[PDB]
Amino acid sequence: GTGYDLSNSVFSPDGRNFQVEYAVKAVENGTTSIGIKCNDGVVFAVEKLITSKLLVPQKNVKIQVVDRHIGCVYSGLIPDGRHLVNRGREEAASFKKLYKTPIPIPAFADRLGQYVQAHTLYNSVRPFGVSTIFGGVDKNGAHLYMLEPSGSYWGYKGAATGKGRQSAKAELEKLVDHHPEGLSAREAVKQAAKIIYLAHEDNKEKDFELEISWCSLSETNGLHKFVKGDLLQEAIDFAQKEIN
Amino acid sequence: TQQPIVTGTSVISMKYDNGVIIAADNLGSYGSLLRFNGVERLIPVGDNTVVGISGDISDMQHIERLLKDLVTENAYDNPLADAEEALEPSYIFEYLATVMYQRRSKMNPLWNAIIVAGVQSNGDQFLRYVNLLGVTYSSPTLATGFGAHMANPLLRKVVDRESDIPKTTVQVAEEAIVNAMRVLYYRDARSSRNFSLAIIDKNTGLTFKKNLQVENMKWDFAKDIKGYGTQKI
């Protein structure tokens, strides 16, 4: 019969979970955001559609930090994203409190994973309406991850989600091939600003505002920090230039 | 309700014209046994605040973790975390004072005497005290335990009232703190010769000096002292 798509933990005859798949639609309908792993860190960037001139510039920040070494960006239902970071922040505090060492990115990833997967087990809750890109530097390197509404997640070399995920994923695949030796923190920052300007075409109608953040063992000391002022402008230019 | 085990003695402090100074030796006693010597009892929070703690060391280490967490938390979703919205000494104090009182009210205190020293964003000096009972107060000079009896009298001879703050210089002030530490080494049987000193100046910022030592002590006259009254040799 039918109706398999009205309740969250229900398996359709083909073994799928429609509500989760619908949530994904909500993710695809959102702003585009990415993650670029580099030789000693990771860079995060996202598109911020300027609905109007009334929006105070540079204010409505979207990228989020967890603990002091993890960065998180997401596309889809924004509030759902904050909810997931909040959980991650508790998840992290808990880990550090018992083990003393700040939480490893892989460990942190499973924390979010298990929690998100949890919301696909009962019909009393709704799956998350976002795909999250997050990562950081730890005891053994940098790590980049992307988590889907199904609770699925893997480690990436580069990742993108949202409206222009294809443009981005395309630009990202190039970089991966033409840089087997690995990009650099400084380079990844400009590269990111570009992938974002390109992926903005799938939304070229509204004006936007770029946002970048990075976590590099050498550029930030393994701590997550936002790109501001000069370094930011230098990247906007590198993008605005190659967009022509 | 508990009972302290490993403890730290005095924490002295005072404010001068441009900031505040605070010091505490590096000892961690276990009753009469001077067990640990590499104990830092001065907790810097941010760069405009230093928290000096005395009492149970295990409880101190706990307050240490709370403080680091306070910073991590203040950073969340805060774009002005290193500017207009960075932690102030008064915020750090009100928080600790809140905790101390709640814990004493649950009959399970954090066995400490704390002194929060720093400079507010508008330049004002901040110096306040809080202990296991939740009691709080401010004064141009502040000291805990033994220092309350020997350090305050000395330090007060420099800054006796509010009007003396602007007349006192870091040089004069630091001199007093350092002499007070020497006196405490003379009469406090739970003190160490090595200590840490920190200055929070509204212009020069935070200066944190480690591994200091009591110097210029007078002990020579001890050779003339023999017997306890009538003995001559």
Question: For residue A90, what is the nearest residue in chain B, using CA coordinates?
Answer: B73
Closest in A61, A68, A226 to B72, CB measured: A68
Q: Which residues lie closer than 8 Å to A68 by C-beta, 6 or more apart?
A: A102, A223, A224, B72, B75
In a 13 Å sphere around the CA of A208, the CA atoms on its Cβ side amount to: 23
Separation between Cα atoms, residue B39 and residue B29, nearest integer Å: 10
Task: Report the gap between the CA of B76 and the closest CA in chain A (Å).
Answer: 6
Structural contact between residues A98 and A163, judged by C-beta atoms closer than 8 angstroms = no
Strands (E), chain A: 33-38, 41-50, 64-66, 70-76, 130-138, 141-147, 153-155, 158-161, 207-216, 224-226
A31 among known catalytic residues: yes
Q: Which two tokens stand for residue B189?
A: 């049987």
Structural contact between residues B60 and B40, judged by C-beta atoms closer than 8 angstroms = no
Burial of A178 (0-12, 13-18, 19+ CB in 10 A): exposed
Q: Is the dihedral of CA A119, A121, A124, A126 positive or negative?
A: positive
Residue B4 is which amino acid? Answer: P
3-state secondary structure of B126: strand
Q: At what angle do helices B170-187 and B146-156 cross, to 10 degrees?
A: 140
Separation between Cα atoms, residue A101 and residue A90, nearest integer Å: 15
Helix H or strand E encompassing B208: strand B205-213
The single residue listed with the structure tokens 């960075």 is B86
Residue A155 forms beta bridges with which residues? A145
The single residue listed with the structure tokens 């501001």 is A228
Residue numbers in A near B69 (CB within 8 A) = 93
CB–CB contact A61 B65 (8 Å): no
The single residue listed with the structure tokens 């980049």 is A144
Q: What angle do CA A235, A211, A117 make, to 5 degrees?
A: 130
Residue numbers in A near B79 (CB within 8 A) = 61, 226
DSSP-assigned states of every residue in B21-53: EEEEE--EEETTEEEES----EEEETTTEEEEE
Residue A211 forms beta bridges with which residues? A46
Looking at residue A167, the DSSP 8-state letter turns out to be H
- A1-244: CATH homologous superfamily? Aminohydrolase, N-terminal nucleophile (Ntn) domain (3.60.20.10)
Task: Report the gap between the CA of A89 and the closest CA in chain B (Å).
Answer: 9
Structural contact between residues A162 and A32, judged by C-beta atoms closer than 8 angstroms = yes
Separation between Cα atoms, residue A54 and residue A199, nearest integer Å: 24
Residue B187 is which amino acid? Answer: R
Structural contact between residues A7 and A123, judged by C-beta atoms closer than 8 angstroms = yes
3-state secondary structure of A226: strand
Question: First-to-last CA distance in chain B?
Answer: 53
The single residue listed with the structure tokens 């296991």 is B132
Structural contact between residues A214 and A44, judged by C-beta atoms closer than 8 angstroms = yes
Q: Which residues lie closer than 8 Å to A99 by C-beta, 6 or more apart?
A: none
Domain boundaries, chain B: 1-233
Phi–psi pair at B15, nearest 5 degrees: -115, 145
Experimental method: X-ray
Separation between Cα atoms, residue A78 and residue A30, nearest integer Å: 9
Separation between Cα atoms, residue B199 and residue B173, nearest integer Å: 10
- B1-233: CATH homologous superfamily? Aminohydrolase, N-terminal nucleophile (Ntn) domain (3.60.20.10)
Residue A76 is which amino acid? Answer: G
Question: For residue A100, what is the nearest residue in chain B, using CA coordinates?
Answer: B65
Residue positions counted in chain A = 244
Residue A80 CB neighbours (<10 A):
21
